Amino acid sequence: QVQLVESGGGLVQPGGSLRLSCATSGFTFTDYYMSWVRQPPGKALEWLGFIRNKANGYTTEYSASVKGRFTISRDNSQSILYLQMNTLRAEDSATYYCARDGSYAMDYWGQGTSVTVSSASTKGPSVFPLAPSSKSTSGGTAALGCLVKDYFPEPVTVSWNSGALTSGVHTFPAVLQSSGLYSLSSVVTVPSSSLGTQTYICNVNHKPSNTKVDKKVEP
């Protein structure tokens, strides 16, 4: 029943500040050391520091990469763990996780919260259909999809036919283009003999800019 839920992450201008929180339940909070770990997209996990338990006056420790800038603290009456991040840099962009230091380790982890540091503004994505061209090889299955281009910051979510269509679906990881915006494509397989008779819709959801688009992928 041990649970940790984080919140507080988002987009923040460089040199700015943000406070991450991790609300816990299911165990005696004051009994444990609590830690913060981060993971930049595509990289290895990095320990950031811990805050001790009651028997140690809740003192703190930090990694060399955040000492002086990040402050860890805890509200024992509400059993909430915090991470105050100041003078934020671009290399601070990553998914932050809190962990309870039980079982002689870090045994229960939060679900993580994303932090993006950058001056770029919230921009919605353009959504284009990917449809087989006039030349459709005499095979069996036909592919189709959606191009979700030039949006910022991450992430975007895509589904097909309101979740109805799931098998053979592939939504690729987003890549950063020559400029600074992201883009990704989602595709799905289907029977060549079906493209026309049926309707395929890709549902693109991009919370960071309150966008929710349903692109009908016509032949």
């Binding site: 060399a64 679900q111 284009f128 061209s133 999809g145 191009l147 283009q177």
Partner: protein, 217 residues
């Protein structure tokens, strides 16, 4: 001061086999009380890390016994036996004896299987995007293995360079294969200027490179 060296950075292995990961520390980490705080974590794509092994060889609560850790002083090991889909992910060793605590560099374990040829598709830009003055042409390489694959774009037979980007999915949970998309981005004027757009694929699952194309016509 302390340094955690974890190897190999990447580690392919087929179903049912044994994988072993190493983790060395520049300096001993055993306590006076005889306790060695060296841990092993598994992070599956899109999920948070999960504890596997604590205090060198103790197995955490929901961990099948196929996993086991061993080691002494400055050399520790994690051995997985009879691998399977689920086990796919990145493993990390972690030293909690000294402060600052520290993570090893990580080990991406991937499932190696039997060579599979990709099913190839090409998609022209939508008339809708052209209005914006940009043309994205997409080439999809579906369900293939190994990951290695080369994709060349040819416009009116002329090879293209520097204007395409690739993106690869994570190893499918079921069949262990990959999928890939390659996007060639041109200006609208440039796209309208040419006629034949082709995607040429080279993969150790195809005798001769496969090519998919369309005519802007």
């Amino acid at each position: 001061e302390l340094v955690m060296t974890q190897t190999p950075l990447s580690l392919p292995v087929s179903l049912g086999d044994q994988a072993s990961i190493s983790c060395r520390s520049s300096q001993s980490i055993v306590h006076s009380n005889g306790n060695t705080y060296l841990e092993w974590y598994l992070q599956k794509p899109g999920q948070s890390p999960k504890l596997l092994i604590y205090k060198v060889s103790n197995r955490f609560s929901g961990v099948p016994d196929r996993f086991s850790g061993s080691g002494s002083g400055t050399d520790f090991t994690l051995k997985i036996s009879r691998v399977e889909a689920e086990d796919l992910g990145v493993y990390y060793c972690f030293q909690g004896s000294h402060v600052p605590r520290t993570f090893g560099g990580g080990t991406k374990l991937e499932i190696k299987r039997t060579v599979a040829a990709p099913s190839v598709f090409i998609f022209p830009p939508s008339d809708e995007q052209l209005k914006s003055g940009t043309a994205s042409v997409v080439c999809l390489l579906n369900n293939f293995y190994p990951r290695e694959a080369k994709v060349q774009w040819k416009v009116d037979n002329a090879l293209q360079s520097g204007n395409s980007q690739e993106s690869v999915t994570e190893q499918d949970s079921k069949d262990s294969t990959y999928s890939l998309s390659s996007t060639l981005t041109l200006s609208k004027a440039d796209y309208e200027k040419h006629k034949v757009y082709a995607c040429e694929v080279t993969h150790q699952g195809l005798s001769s490179p496969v090519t998919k194309s369309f005519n802007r016509g």
